[PDB]
Ligand binder design. Structure first.
Ligand SMILES: [Ca+2]
Length: 223
């Protein structure tokens, strides 16, 4: 997260870190057994880390649970990042509490102009590299479809939306990938891609979760 703020320990209790020996992506806990992340975050041997604030220090509220299954969207295309969504099943159910909690899936898509909460442990520099210890947060508005397509001509599908600031300086970034965009208390986006981070006229691009609720529900009911 570039240009954001320190969330506060466990104030984003659905935020997970995906660890394969190191933090590499975020994700969102949607019930005690399932995490939503980006398909581009797929790899084998994922351990899901819940209840994290400082990802480098055991502070006492973490739950570390291995992934038992990862399901990449059937139509995921890594070249275009269309359908950049994956489900991760936990080997055992998380214990839900005040610091580890699920985020609701949307019943309707979110609206342009709504301020959403984006969070993660990704790079905090728009040029160069600096990674935070504690979870970072950014409030950013959903941009109009037309402005999103104007920023990324030929690259925005109906399964993507833009959020952020055309002036630059505030954005998600690498390492936030797979993490949540929460609007009005619902998971509406997944950190997906962008040109650089926090660059002028290049806002963040996010997977449009509301298009995937039927697939999520069917998949969870069968796995
Ligand atoms: Ca920790």
């Amino acid at each position: 997260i570039v240009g954001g703020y320190t969330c506060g320990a466990n104030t984003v209790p659905y935020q997970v870190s995906l660890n394969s020996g190191y933090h590499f992506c975020g994700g969102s806990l949607i019930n005690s057994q399932w995490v939503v992340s980006a398909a581009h975050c797929y790899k084998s041997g994922i351990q899901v880390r819940l209840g994290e604030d400082n990802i480098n220090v055991v502070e006492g509220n973490e739950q570390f649970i291995s992934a038992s299954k990862s399901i990449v969207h059937p139509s995921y295309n890594s070249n275009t990042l269309n359908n950049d969504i994956m489900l991760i099943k936990l080997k055992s159910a998380a214990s839900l509490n005040s610091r580890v909690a699920s985020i609701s899936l949307p019943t309707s898509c979110a609206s342009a102009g709504t301020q959403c909460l984006i969070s993660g442990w990704g790079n905090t520099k728009s040029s160069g590299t600096s990674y935070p210890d504690v979870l970072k947060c950014l409030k950013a508005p959903i941009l109009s479809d037309s402005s999103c397509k104007s920023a990324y001509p030929g690259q925005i599908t109906s399964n993507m939306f833009c959020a952020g600031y055309l002036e630059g300086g505030k954005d998600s970034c690498q390492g936030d990938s797979g993490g949540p965009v929460v609007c009005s208390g619902k998971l509406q986006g997944i950190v997906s891609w962008g040109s650089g981070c926090a660059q002028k006229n290049k806002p963040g691009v996010y997977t449009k979760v509301c298009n995937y609720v039927s697939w999520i529900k069917q998949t969870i009911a069968s796995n």
